[PDB]
Enzyme design. Sequence first.
Site, PDB file in Angstrom:
ATOM      1  N   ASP A   1      -4.627  -5.824  -3.643  1.00  0.00           N
ATOM      2  CA  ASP A   1      -3.941  -4.653  -3.308  1.00  0.00           C
ATOM      3  C   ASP A   1      -3.487  -4.023  -4.604  1.00  0.00           C
ATOM      4  O   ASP A   1      -2.313  -4.255  -4.880  1.00  0.00           O
ATOM      5  CB  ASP A   1      -2.515  -5.289  -2.490  1.00  0.00           C
ATOM      6  CG  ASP A   1      -1.696  -4.214  -1.887  1.00  0.00           C
ATOM      7  OD1 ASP A   1      -2.464  -2.842  -2.115  1.00  0.00           O
ATOM      8  OD2 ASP A   1      -0.637  -4.379  -1.244  1.00  0.00           O
TER       9      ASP A   1
ATOM     10  N   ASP B   1      -4.679   2.950  -2.871  1.00  0.00           N
ATOM     11  CA  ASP B   1      -4.162   1.791  -2.124  1.00  0.00           C
ATOM     12  C   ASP B   1      -5.091   0.863  -1.303  1.00  0.00           C
ATOM     13  O   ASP B   1      -5.396   1.543  -0.061  1.00  0.00           O
ATOM     14  CB  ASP B   1      -2.881   2.306  -1.259  1.00  0.00           C
ATOM     15  CG  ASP B   1      -2.254   1.315  -0.484  1.00  0.00           C
ATOM     16  OD1 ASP B   1      -2.303   0.084  -1.154  1.00  0.00           O
ATOM     17  OD2 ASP B   1      -1.571   1.546   0.519  1.00  0.00           O
TER      18      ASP B   1
HETATM   19  C1  LIG Z   1       2.021  -1.196   7.343  1.00  0.00           C
HETATM   20  C2  LIG Z   1       0.990  -0.239   6.573  1.00  0.00           C
HETATM   21  C3  LIG Z   1      -0.530  -0.182   7.359  1.00  0.00           C
HETATM   22  C4  LIG Z   1       1.206   1.136   6.267  1.00  0.00           C
HETATM   23  C5  LIG Z   1       0.568  -1.101   5.137  1.00  0.00           C
HETATM   24  C6  LIG Z   1       0.298  -2.603   5.183  1.00  0.00           C
HETATM   25  N1  LIG Z   1       0.065  -3.044   3.745  1.00  0.00           N
HETATM   26  C7  LIG Z   1       0.934  -3.928   3.332  1.00  0.00           C
HETATM   27  O1  LIG Z   1       1.903  -4.214   3.951  1.00  0.00           O
HETATM   28  C8  LIG Z   1       0.811  -4.348   1.873  1.00  0.00           C
HETATM   29  C9  LIG Z   1       1.831  -3.567   1.062  1.00  0.00           C
HETATM   30  C10 LIG Z   1       1.590  -1.968   1.088  1.00  0.00           C
HETATM   31  C11 LIG Z   1       2.727  -1.466   1.752  1.00  0.00           C
HETATM   32  C12 LIG Z   1       2.685   0.008   2.169  1.00  0.00           C
HETATM   33  C13 LIG Z   1       4.005   0.695   2.749  1.00  0.00           C
HETATM   34  C14 LIG Z   1       3.809   1.896   2.905  1.00  0.00           C
HETATM   35  C15 LIG Z   1       4.853   2.384   3.672  1.00  0.00           C
HETATM   36  C16 LIG Z   1       4.942   3.068   4.783  1.00  0.00           C
HETATM   37  C17 LIG Z   1       6.079   3.865   5.389  1.00  0.00           C
HETATM   38  C18 LIG Z   1       7.074   3.955   4.443  1.00  0.00           C
HETATM   39  C19 LIG Z   1       7.352   3.661   3.143  1.00  0.00           C
HETATM   40  C20 LIG Z   1       5.810   2.785   2.677  1.00  0.00           C
HETATM   41  C21 LIG Z   1       5.962   2.602   1.181  1.00  0.00           C
HETATM   42  C22 LIG Z   1       5.151   3.472   0.323  1.00  0.00           C
HETATM   43  C23 LIG Z   1       4.609   2.819  -0.942  1.00  0.00           C
HETATM   44  C24 LIG Z   1       3.727   2.020  -0.881  1.00  0.00           C
HETATM   45  C25 LIG Z   1       3.230   1.395  -2.129  1.00  0.00           C
HETATM   46  C26 LIG Z   1       3.750   1.767  -3.559  1.00  0.00           C
HETATM   47  N2  LIG Z   1       3.248   1.455  -4.511  1.00  0.00           N
HETATM   48  C27 LIG Z   1       3.614   1.654  -5.748  1.00  0.00           C
HETATM   49  O2  LIG Z   1       4.440   2.567  -6.116  1.00  0.00           O
HETATM   50  C28 LIG Z   1       3.125   0.825  -6.961  1.00  0.00           C
HETATM   51  C29 LIG Z   1       1.597   0.244  -6.843  1.00  0.00           C
HETATM   52  C30 LIG Z   1       1.180  -0.263  -8.003  1.00  0.00           C
HETATM   53  C31 LIG Z   1       1.785  -0.281  -9.110  1.00  0.00           C
HETATM   54  F1  LIG Z   1       1.243  -1.089 -10.208  1.00  0.00           F
HETATM   55  C32 LIG Z   1       3.069   0.057  -9.306  1.00  0.00           C
HETATM   56  C33 LIG Z   1       3.698   0.572  -8.044  1.00  0.00           C
HETATM   57  C34 LIG Z   1       4.933   2.711  -3.288  1.00  0.00           C
HETATM   58  N3  LIG Z   1       5.093   3.205  -2.203  1.00  0.00           N
HETATM   59  C35 LIG Z   1       2.646   2.626   2.627  1.00  0.00           C
HETATM   60  C36 LIG Z   1       1.614   2.024   2.095  1.00  0.00           C
HETATM   61  C37 LIG Z   1       1.551   0.691   1.888  1.00  0.00           C
HETATM   62  N4  LIG Z   1       0.641   0.119   1.136  1.00  0.00           N
HETATM   63  C38 LIG Z   1       0.507  -1.189   0.866  1.00  0.00           C
HETATM   64  N5  LIG Z   1      -0.578  -1.843   0.019  1.00  0.00           N
END
Ligand SMILES: CC(C)(C)CCNC(=O)CCc1cc2cc(-c3ccccc3CCc3ccc(NC(=O)c4ccc(F)cc4)cn3)ccc2nc1N
Length: 369
Positions: A221, A34
């Site tokens: 990203d 990521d």
């Molecule tokens: C807020 C932060 C500092 C943790 C992340 C800041 N980044 C962003 O806002 C950009 C999008 C992003 C959001 C995210 C959110 C989280 C998060 C935090 C708390 C609860 C839930 C989450 C979401 C977990 C998550 C993130 C990304 C994915 N991605 C995929 O499944 C995926 C990636 C590539 C693809 F081709 C298909 C699916 C799945 N689950 C974790 C990592 C992240 N990584 C990212 N690049």
Amino acid sequence: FVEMVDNLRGKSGQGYYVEMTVGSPPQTLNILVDTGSSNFAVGAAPHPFLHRYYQRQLSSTYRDLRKGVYVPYTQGKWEGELGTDLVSIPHGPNVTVRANIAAITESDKFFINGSNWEGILGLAYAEIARPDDSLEPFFDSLVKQTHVPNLFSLQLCGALASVGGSMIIGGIDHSLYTGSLWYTPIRREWYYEVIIVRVEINGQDLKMDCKEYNYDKSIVDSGTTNLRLPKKVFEAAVKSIKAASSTEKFPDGFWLGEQLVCWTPWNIFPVISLYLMGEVTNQSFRITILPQQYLRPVEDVDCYKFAISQSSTGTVMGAVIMEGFYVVFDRARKRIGFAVSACHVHDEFRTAAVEGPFVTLDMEDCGYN
Ligand SMILES: CC(C)(C)CCNC(=O)CCc1cc2cc(-c3ccccc3CCc3ccc(NC(=O)c4ccc(F)cc4)cn3)ccc2nc1N
């Protein structure tokens, strides 16, 4: 770097993960790659969606940092306990480093039911690390404690159909790309932030003020599926993409990502080009993706799904972009390289493209402040 080739796996829609080990004796985990986050965070308690999880007290090399971390995100959150341990990448450089690990004890909408990964490897910079920029991200620890050079490169290969690809740590592998590598500057080291200077649909300029393409930022990203665009750009992008594909008729909600289309007439759909700020004054280059990148199969409903959407936090160049290219995260020189991917999905007529140089004036004006 041949031992690192093909070290990524995944399912369509569920991310690209790399195998890692943590602790002594090593505990194997699959970890999402990521470039849009900066924490190394692993499941460390038996959430029902997990194949497995980090068990600290089985590691003789684990060290508790006696601090918690709570990370909310739009829908849900993760919460955990900070420490350090020995971390390696079996199909990566033959080294082991002491890295920070966030042991996830409680979470909502973080793990995916049916996925085969148990944590996230945040590869972006310290500034967006949680709780703050003193939690050294994994890649910073890798570089600092070893002789591994300060760069990694990603080749994501799109298709639950299985995706795969390569994360080359410390270098570049020439089998992974064709033609030349062109570099855009990393504007600032937090996210992998870049500046888009022009957008074209099938070779016709969107003709917007280029500040709009980077409002409030643009990032590369691997953690996101879609090509996400600011609202104004998304509307113009969609309007022009609609016009190109006016022969065949799709539902109105399709373009908003509320439904899918089945049959494959690749001809009808346009190519999409982003021009990126170049390395030299007044110089840019362009990357072009095919309908094969932005029409993503939705398997478990040939059926496809529209993967361009709108943002309030800026342009996200996700897997929709990255699956077209070999992307070189050249941290030591504060630049990101793009070349045509040896594994990108194309047809017998068109392909993804990286070309330059082009002359673009006032590119700095395109950056948001
Ligand atoms: C807020 C932060 C500092 C943790 C992340 C800041 N980044 C962003 O806002 C950009 C999008 C992003 C959001 C995210 C959110 C989280 C998060 C935090 C708390 C609860 C839930 C989450 C979401 C977990 C998550 C993130 C990304 C994915 N991605 C995929 O499944 C995926 C990636 C590539 C693809 F081709 C298909 C699916 C799945 N689950 C974790 C990592 C992240 N990584 C990212 N690049």
